[PDB]
């Protein structure tokens, strides 16, 4: 019945969105800005107990990562593994979130130079607390995100030129690209 | 199983009522002139056919054509090979659950609908007899696909000793049937609370297709089976009707029986038709004798000349009714709608007058621009009815100028430019500038600027408000008899059966009398109207010198000749006479004076 | 419950309430109470040519196994009857219960002193088209009376429910008097064969217990000039328990009033249970009748 | 397990053995009556909602649906002893749940809320139609038996497997075609209705999957509220956003009620209960056979307005109405009665129109600006990419028996007035702009609250000088109720003492005791309060049809026509064939409230002495002479 | 028939993808008018957007268009025949004979 | 589907390589023969079709001998064979409500 989180706040230095490249991976960097175009409230998973119905589907598996639709590690008996999964709704706690876009403040914009932006996932009790339309600060953990090219119906720029190196994993040959995004933990709105 | 077959080949060669031997006496009559079709009749078919339908209700979708294989085997008995298969047409009538009980107990049972058909698609083809080749092993077979569960009743297998799916569809020895996907619409009267109507889809067979035009009352009887298109949640399918037989009402292409026309000729010799209709057309209208005669001539019309040159005359008349509120110009117009063969009713606000005649839009398949919609193309041969000719100034006048007077439109939108035919007949009922002031001032102020529409219509009534103390009290005596008591519904039913004509008899003889005779006026009348006009123009000519302007021009003079041709369609005489034509001007001479006062 | 094998378990709903008019109501409880026993099956359009023709034998059995357990408990024995039937080989089964019903209505409709002649020439003529109804040669005229009959009851019940709710039946002392002064559709009361049926419906509204004053009524109606007023009397009825000799008392009194003054009274109609009266004579009619106790 | 078998036994007695409120067997009444219509519905009474909830709330939120599946099979055997043989007739019942204590809306849905009972509102946007659902999957093997029984399929999850209990091979499970019953399935997507919402922002979207006997109850455009559960079934495939550990919500509904109004209640008017059987119907007869009712009722309608009589009488007549009566193959007859209020800026004309909106069953309140000519009646909303030009209604086709407003939108007067005076004249109007040529049905009622340019007596000159409307659109109405006051001492206190006392009108026993306080506070003079008064109106409009006589009708023909003569020889605006059709109609509206189907003599003179004075008093200075005329009419 | 949708002398870039990879400037109304005659009605009962098109095709024999594709000068030899009506009834004699329709004098 | 009559086994191929030898295949294109292919839709002569419908249409595949002969707007009169092609009902599975019998005219 107990689920927690870690909420730091009030680091000294506050940056802008144009200063986030190299040292900022796995760091903690407070970021200002203004917010526009929220979205709705859907649930996430972080842990399941799905398993195949081969003999017994009561294996609480691990690793609910960004492609988590395959619990296939350490089956219970000597049975058939990775043959199925049944994501029950009855035993795995969820946590609720929303995806929002931010934007740079008006007292810093050098010229009218198509002011760039990025996106951010907020996942704890931070839900529905960023009212859209205020000068807002954030927690700071930076994160990269892929697309694993799941079993769905699909699998200008030279994008993914980096990703041509990312070929030849043990699953199928493709190009897994990347994009810098943001995970938060704690909001504030001074203003 | 089989053997059902033996229960019916030993059943339709002997069913009869008392010594008429009917089904051989019509199948013999139906193999001769090529139709290849049946019907069924009454109760014992029902009496033991339920005892067959208690083994046919389980699947009336595969053993309905187990009837069909039988009657071919009785057909060759009446021949002695070119023999097609047949089709079935049914009949049943108890009531009409309109569109309510449609998923629970009505999958694959016999249903009866009442609807208004609106939209026809172009024809297509599916096969019924094929020939099949294995590829590298060259087997030859033939499969027949008769009735359906839309496509894929059975498939083609893998067995020929050649490779997998080696089968191909030649086109050398094949037959074909056509389907429709015409759309059905609910009759807009049966379920009012606050809702909007819905719609279904259906197909048919060739010897019952192309039997409906859009804009009619219809009834239909058939199955409620289910297909599944893969172009939305769980695996859900859609509904459609497989129809069997349209025992419709009339077409509302001039073939019918003979006893209908026997009474018509027996009525048309009694020369009281012109006065007896004016009482019998509108059983709910106090008098209004000048207006009432204008409607019966409007419904039938004149003719059409394609005379040996290039041009043509326009054989039609178009009336107007303008006057004070409370003079029954409105509710008279619903009355012409049911009695017409083809009628629409778009009477309000123009309804986007550019999109009255034509519409084009993008397409879900192939992204194309083709022609779909119109108010006029639906309404050919008949009569439209609109109103409010004061507060439409946008496009209503620029849309009817071409649509009238030549009746030949061509859309020049992004796709085609085609001159589609039109033979329409219009009707309108507007308001003047609040009525009384247009009858208490200078006689102008009717249309805001232009009179050019008014020259395009010939007949104009201008009603008014009197105060005659004896004609109102009769009217106040009239409408309480027709409101409650419904005693005149018992009175007019009592003078019906020997003297008057109901509504369903008027409709059927108008389409007969129009589509048979072709009048022409006599050259003795040529001296009559010529002597008439020269003082009519002079009566106008004496008025202009008194600084009185406005409108009469020569369309009306070629409109009176259509008016005198109209009652010649009524009497069905191939000439026109002088007691014919003197009563005709007596309608229009009356409407010349009110054009001045 | 009649004409079922010909048709309409729909318009049975009216004359099922006729049967509940034989019980304790005319509209109120039944328009709830009928909806235990009837809309159990929605009544179709195509297979209703087969279900209330054929597999209503599963349901006639079911009423046969409904009313056997409505027998020691309800005990209302106006429904089960032995009856008689005939067939033609084909063309449906037609019994004789409904068959007399078509002959009555088809005799009705199917068409100084100047109006009575053109009224009397009608009833002889429309009689004549019923006499030839006994061949096989009349088929598509046989159903004409059938579809005529199942509106005439709907016509006659339309006004019977009116004169109840008007509450103009007055038990004065002996009988009850009702004068239908004016309603709608007065034309269907010139020919007297409808009037005994209207009484036949009206004698059964008062066929409750009524353990005193079992006396039938006398009605009144007028359509034509000079107040012809084809007044008539009925018979009292028994709820299936004739022990007492109750034929009629009125014809004895009908000799009396006709013998008094001859001031425009008429007995020209054939059956003695119907006479005529003048408008100013019907009020001294009853005053002569409320004292002349001849039962 | 097996202890739930006792649970079904334990609740069954806990239901039917008790009836609250002095007995009279309430729960036994709901069951037998919705047997008699055969319509598959039950309820939960409010006062023993909570006592049926208290020992069952921990068995609500723990499992809301499997408790219901075992809740359903006891209701078969509940009625089976009462009505037998509900097996050959559709063999199926499922329960419903009444109102629930919960306020919240779409903004507040957490992970703690799921798999539980939820109540939420919104507006129904664009919907689909009705399809059949399989619901009983007969599975088909190829080699072994192709009949695996009609299954219990889920919602939109597409439950299947590879191989079980026949073999272990890849012979796929297929279909065949016999004895699989079908229910229906109608997916309405839902937008949040922009009422109780912190404004200036966007709507939010959800999904509703209806069930079998809950099809097409709502219409595309009203506001509703649902009492569903919160099932979150999806595989984890989504394509507007990328693939993620994310789940989507689906609200499977359990019941549905309509537009609610005046959300202030505590123990009543939360459900349209509307069941009038043993106690209510016995009562409704004896309230109808009294000799002063229509004098008492119209005094009892507007509770808080001390005004003159006739406006209450007409607005009593408007929502009662006559008959859309049938006719043969000829013209139909208007079955609606439409009134018009002329007033002064400062009397209470804006409130009686407000008050009737609650007391009617259905309504709409299109007022002021924005009333576009296409916007009231039907419009054609354009298609999305693979769609077609469909037909979406506006105001009137929703409001079958309601209210609009046209006072004086002076600029937009010429825009839409050519669309409402053909709703009465050409009654049942629809149109064909750029689409299909159909015609819907709308037997709507119009009231209006027009406003003269300045004061009420802007002139001694007549009504065509006073209002800016012209004649024909004005002539569709029945009566121009007009107000007036200059100076009156005793009449003013009769308002002034009246209005100040209204501002003085600012736990099972206590829930009852507040109600008697709520009952006494309306009962200062006890004018038959609104707890029962609206409830018999709804079947005073859907169960009784009046008819007429002949011998008393022709006495008013000269009373019409000689008044037609004096009004034509002396007239501002004329009466026509129109007005007399309203004369007989507002007569029979009164006798419709005697619940009696007949027309008397006591009403026609009452109906006349409403119209004639209310016509003549609007004329001029020359009105004192006409009052010497009308007592001859009386 | 002089119904004046944009298409009286142009293409409006209607290609219909011409089997996945072919874009065609489909001929509206000038491939029929070449070395022939046309006739159109109701000049004053038209919008503005046709009048700018009849300006170009009269001063110049050709139209040239680049809507979402190719500039192309295709040739045309046309000859219009006109039909319009005066505005204010029979007002021609009591006023100026000119401006009597008052459509732009670019065409007159 | 151009021989107009015989439904032969098709060759689902564009160009072969490496016949049964070790020689790299070369192709002579001057001695390879070609032909053209043009579809055109024909409306209805909108005077003799009676007034109950819009004009319908079908299509026709012709060959080189009378291409560029058909200006849009010509009273044409063609004659050819009536012909169906295409697999209706098997080339996809379950095939519900999809016609697979296209009307064609391979004419002269
Ligand atoms: N001459 C007449 N004979 C019989 N009935 C009439 C006549 N004139 C009007 N009525 C009656 O008027 C009733 C209602 O018509 P209504 O008042 O809608 O006319 P209206 O549409 O107002 O007239 P207008 O079209 O001039 O505005 C109808 O039931 C019709 O029977
Ligand atoms: N006779 C009355 N009894 C009780 N309250 C009244 C009375 N007359 C006016 N009021 C009060 O005056 C307030 C002002 O609203 P009012 O009814 O005057 O608007 P109105 O002038 O009718 O508006 P509109 O002119 O737009 O219809 C109302 O809230 C109402 O409570």
Numbering used by the authors:
A (entry chain l): 260 to 414, 428 to 463
B (entry chain k): 24 to 103, 130 to 198, 201 to 211, 235 to 305, 319 to 339, 346 to 643, 647 to 693
C (entry chain e): 326 to 436, 462 to 591, 597 to 650
D (entry chain h): 201 to 706, 737 to 864
E (entry chain i): 433 to 540
F (entry chain i): 217 to 324
Extract from the study:
Replication in eukaryotes utilizes CMG helicase (Cdc45−Mcm2-7−GINS), leading and lagging strand DNA polymerases (Pol) ε and δ, Pol α-primase, PCNA clamps, the RFC clamp loader, and numerous accessory factors of less defined function. Ctf4 (Chromosome Transmission Fidelity 4) is a homo-trimer (Ctf43) that connects Pol α-primase and CMG helicase. The structures of the C-half of Ctf4 and its human orthologue AND1 reveal a disc-shaped constitutive trimer via the β-propeller domains on the N-terminal face (N-face) with the three C-terminal helical domains interacting with up to three CIP peptides on the C-face. We sought to address these questions by a combination of biochemistry and cryo-EM and found that one Ctf43 binds CMG very tight, not dynamic, and can bind 1, 2, or 3 CMG holoenzymes without steric hinderance at a 120° angle to one another.
Density scans of fractions within the SEC elution profile indicated a heterogeneous mixture of CMG–Ctf43 complexes, with CMG:Ctf43 ratios ranging from 3:1 to 1:1. We therefore examined different fractions by cryo-EM and found that indeed, more than one CMG can bind Ctf43. Therefore, one Ctf43 may organize up to three CMGs. Indeed, we observed 2D class averages that show two or three CMGs per Ctf43, related by the three-fold axis of Ctf43. The current report demonstrates that two (or three) CMG can bind Ctf4 tightly, that CMGs bound to the Ctf4 trimer retain activity, and that a complex of 2(CMG–Pol ε)–1Ctf43–1Pol α-primase spontaneously assembles in vitro.
